[PDB]
Symmetry: C2
Subunit: 87 residues, 2 copies
């Protein structure tokens, strides 16, 4: 949600930023959870594998937000930053 007063040109720019963005993991988790015994080495392997997808996801998320920040006016950026503190 946004109390930023986005102009229609800005909302268009944003929608375009989002579209430019563009289970196996959970399955492995499931097997760790459902096992008779807890296998720490196997869990560590799954955690490490998960770091790769987290990296990809956090990079897309940050880049997207940065792109949005930089189409805002100075007044809109203040509000964005204030909102960021509140989450």
């Amino acid at each position: 949600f946004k109390d930023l007063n986005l102009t229609d040109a800005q909302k268009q720019q944003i929608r375009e930023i989002m579209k430019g963005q563009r289970l196996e993991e959970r399955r492995a988790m499931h097997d760790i959870i459902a096992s008779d015994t807890f296998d720490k080495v196997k869990a560590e392997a799954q955690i490490a594998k998960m770091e790769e997808q987290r990296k990809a996801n956090m990079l897309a998320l940050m880049e997207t937000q940065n792109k949005i920040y930089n189409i805002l006016t100075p007044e809109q950026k203040k509000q964005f930053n204030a909102n960021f503190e509140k989450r």
Copy 2:
């Protein structure tokens, strides 16, 4: 949804015992710095993302072990319900 499984009295005590270990904004502030810049610095971002790898590992190991311990006190009918629920979850 472990609460959703009609836990027996004994299971609630066992969980209580298990859930004993079972146990941060500086990362947020760094994210904020990356986002509110007039360029996106992928190298700085990558470093930010990597910084709490060890803490993430420790926390996830604890969570996975705890969830494995709880799964194993379940009855066969409770396990079926847990697994079916699992197949529908983010």
